[PDB]
């Protein structure tokens, strides 16, 4: 009988408003005097920031900086919501990994790079590429973080749900007193932990230079496309996500493992001029296990080849109508510290192509599972072994909406480099 919303005591109104999506609060504020006044109350906004974007703001920080959670929600978090998440830059065939993330009164674009070849078990390296900073009484600023000469002015541009780009406006900061050579020597130290000497020999010297020159022509003016981490699944899985992998002379590349029924897929997150970022590097057939012999038979390469080509044949028929481990003799492995015990093996195929991604093709191989987060692929026709190891880092905002959204994402990044 009679009572209205407007008669509830403030504390109660605050509790109700505090439970709503922050996007409903602005309508509420325009309803009347009283609601506008009540919606100043920062607790409401501090909660909206916590639940919707995972950020707890420090109260002491807020007091010092003179910024409020209302400000944060309106001018940082909502304003830039579409660039948050996990991204792959469009850099010819090389790709990349950017996780764009909230930290306090900042939004940070973190670039994740692999460790030095061949140390696939070492942690990912990570420098910041750009940040977005909110200060009192102004719009958040956008700064490019690339270079060695500190934060400076940048621009962000949101094109779509699933694409954005960055411009740097004072590239003078990416330069160095000892010139492009030092830029190169520096980049070489971070990416390789080696000098011009250890690389001048030789086919990798060339590939490494081309990469430096090619990627650095972007001066951090870069377009990013959305990627997602893969769906987890219980019985029907043995554990998806990003891995660091050896790709011969190209060094390590980042490769995403994902499950799709009785097949696992390895999708390139970074790549090279032979098989670019976005492509299917590897496809594991999970209904064709391969029994592991004793060490002495594992050593025999031709036994392994005969066995693998057998399975390839039986597969072509179908479609048409842990113990000690050792690589066979004559199979190269950049790593050498590959585990000497494994839990199981499966038939699979890998994608190969000549320079320029020319005439790609599937070659047979065998996938080797060591432990929950280390696996391998023997490239049969190249007598070569790739050793993969899980990226331990944790990623914020990177989950897919659904399994079909993921599958869709895979098809977009593949087509981009097709």
């Amino acid at each position: 009988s009679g009572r209205s919303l407007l008669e509830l005591p403030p504390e109660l109104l605050v509790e109700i408003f505090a439970s709503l999506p922050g996007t409903d609060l602005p309508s509420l504020a325009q309803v009347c005097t009283k609601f506008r006044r009540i919606l100043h109350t920062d607790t409401i906004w501090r909660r909206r920031c916590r639940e919707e974007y995972g950020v707890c703001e420090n109260l002491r920080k807020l007091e010092i900086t003179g910024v409020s959670c209302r400000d944060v929600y309106a001018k940082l978090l909502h304003r830039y919501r579409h660039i948050l998440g996990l991204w792959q830059p469009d850099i010819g065939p090389y790709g990349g990994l950017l996780n764009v993330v909230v930290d306090g009164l900042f939004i940070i674009g973190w670039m994740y790079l692999p460790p030095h070849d061949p140390h696939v078990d070492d942690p990912m390296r990570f420098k910041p590429l750009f940040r977005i900073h909110l200060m009192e009484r102004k719009a958040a600023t956008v700064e490019c973080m690339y270079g060695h000469k500190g934060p400076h002015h940048g621009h962000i541009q949101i094109v779509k749900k699933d694409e954005f780009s960055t411009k740097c406006n004072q590239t003078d900061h990416h330069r160095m007193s000892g010139g492009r050579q030092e830029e190169f020597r520096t980049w070489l130290r971070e990416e390789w932990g080696r000098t011009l000497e250890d690389i001048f020999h030789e086919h990798m010297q060339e590939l490494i230079l081309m990469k430096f020159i090619y990627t650095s022509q972007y001066d951090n003016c870069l377009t990013y496309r959305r990627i997602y981490l893969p769906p987890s699944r219980p019985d029907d899985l043995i554990k998806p996500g990003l891995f660091k992998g050896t790709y011969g002379s190209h060094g390590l590349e980042i490769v995403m493992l994902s499950f799709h029924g009785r097949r696992a897929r390895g999708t390139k997150i970074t790549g090279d001029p032979n098989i670019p970022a976005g492509q299917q590097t590897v496809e594991i057939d999970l209904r064709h296990r391969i029994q592991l012999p004793d060490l002495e038979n594992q050593r025999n390469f031709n036994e392994l080849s005969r066995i693998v080509l057998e399975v390839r044949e039986r597969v072509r028929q179908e479609q048409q109508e842990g113990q000690p481990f050792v690589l066979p003799v004559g199979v190269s492995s950049r790593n050498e510290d590959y585990p000497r015990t494994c839990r199981m093996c499966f038939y699979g195929t890998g994608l190969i192509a000549g320079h320029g991604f020319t005439s790609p093709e599937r070659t047979p191989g065998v996938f080797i599972l060591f432990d929950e987060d280390r696996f391998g692929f023997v490239w049969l026709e190249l007598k070569s072994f790739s050793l993969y190891s899980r990226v331990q880092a944790t990623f914020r905002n990177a989950d897919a909406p659904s399994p079909q959204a993921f599958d869709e994402m895979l098809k977009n990044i593949q087509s981009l480099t097709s």
């Binding site: 086919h203 032979n274 190269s332 007598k383 070569s384």
Partner: peptide, 9 residues
């Protein structure tokens, strides 16, 4: 090493 064609991966 089998650089003769390892690059194709």
């Amino acid at each position: 090493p089998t650089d003769v064609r390892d690059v194709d991966i």
